[model samples]
Target: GSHTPDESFLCYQPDQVCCFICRGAAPLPSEGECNPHPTAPWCREGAVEWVPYSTGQCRTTCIPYVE
Candidate 1:
């Protein structure tokens, strides 16, 4: 069984800061693995664009789907 976090319901990252968590049954996709302290690749929806919010506070942003 897989568990979904309760905090995964935000439409947009407040202040452009979103979290990417991976569970045993639902691992973070290759595009969502990231460090929230460095400039790196992040994941977003098909057309949801992203912009660097702050320095040294970056993270991969992805939305949870219920399907």
Candidate 2:
């Protein structure tokens, strides 16, 4: 899976999470951010929604992939 940040203002918050835009056989619509890359190709074939996280794992890192 590819983790991509689809926000108007990328990496403005320390708790911001990146969007995953990868296709999985497990489900058509896996959990993802409410925003998608405005200029990136979307092969996800699903919907997006807003989500929140609470923990010390939050950081400002540009994620581009996932396992």
Candidate 3:
């Protein structure tokens, strides 16, 4: 099945930087958590926000409900 929708997630990049992750929508992450760092360096425990991303062409869109 297709994904419910797209959401811009907060990724704790290397050296305390907020990066973008293009994937399905996730529940609002809790705040004030010390997320461990992995080899890839993507931590979702550093707070989250509505990160809108663009993909594909006019035929298919990222967000279903849009104007």
Candidate 4:
């Protein structure tokens, strides 16, 4: 049997600044929101390290869909 290709979604970490869509460093809120599209990535929330001012922070960001 064949399976459909999985698509990646955007996720961001707490306190870290970035774009869930592009995963690029930018101005973000301490408390963010996740508005995953009906067809988004479905993968486990992995710990991502990001820095806004040279200080790195580790956190998890999750959406829905697939890897």
Candidate 5:
């Protein structure tokens, strides 16, 4: 789990509680936002490689690998 403002606070208002990019708790995505970085590479299967982000790196959402 990552740091959160508060469940009752106005900050906790996003539809997705966890980040779609970093898989962490935050309004915006950023590098090092994710606590556990997976050592293994993500499998694409038949999907696209990954969408690029400004602050964060290219991460696969198809597989959720927790360190």
Candidate 6:
């Protein structure tokens, strides 16, 4: 089923989690965060990928795409 905006959520912490993407709360790397980009006209949903950070931590970036 399609997820409502109010149902989307996001969060991260040691042994803790949070989300606000939708109407639910989940882990930092929630399933929605891993959801494949959907099809659309001209522009479509973007994807989040892990990027290397100089702080020795991984950063999530939403890569843009075009139809």
Q: Write the per-residue lDDT of candidate 2 for residues 9-52, one digit (tens) a residue.
A: 12212343343322221112234434434322322222343233
lDDT for each residue of candidate 6 in 1-67, tens digit (9 for 90 to 100): 4643222323333343332232222224633243332222222123333334332323233322221
The deviation in Å at residue 30 for candidate 6 is: 28
What local lDDT does model 1 show for residue 35? 42
lDDT of 5 at 60: 40
Badly placed stretches (over 4 Å) of model 2 are 1-14, 24-33, 38-67
Better of 2 and 6 by lDDT: 6
Q: RMSD for each model, in Å, please?
A: 13.4, 14.1, 13.9, 13.5, 11.9, 13.3
Tell me the tens digit of each residue's lDDT in model 3 across 1-67: 4644333333332233333333543322233222322212233333343344344211111221112
Clashes of each: 0, 0, 1, 5, 0, 16
Name the weakest run of 10 consecutive residues (lDDT summed) in model 3.
Answer: 57-66
Clashes counted in candidate 1 amount to: 0
Candidate 4's TM-score: 0.21
Give the per-residue lDDT digits (tens) of candidate 5, residues 1-67. 4552221101112232222332223224322233333322333332433345454434343323332
The TM-score values for the models, in the order shown, are 0.20, 0.19, 0.24, 0.21, 0.24, 0.21
Over the stretch 40-59, how does candidate 4's per-residue lDDT look in tens digits?
A: 22222343433333322322
lDDT at residue 36 of model 1 (Cα atoms): 27
State the C-alpha lDDT per candidate: 0.32, 0.30, 0.30, 0.33, 0.30, 0.31
Clashes of 6: 16
Off by over 4 Å in 4: 17-67
Output the better candidate (1/2) by lDDT: 1
CA error at residue 9 for candidate 1, angstroms: 20
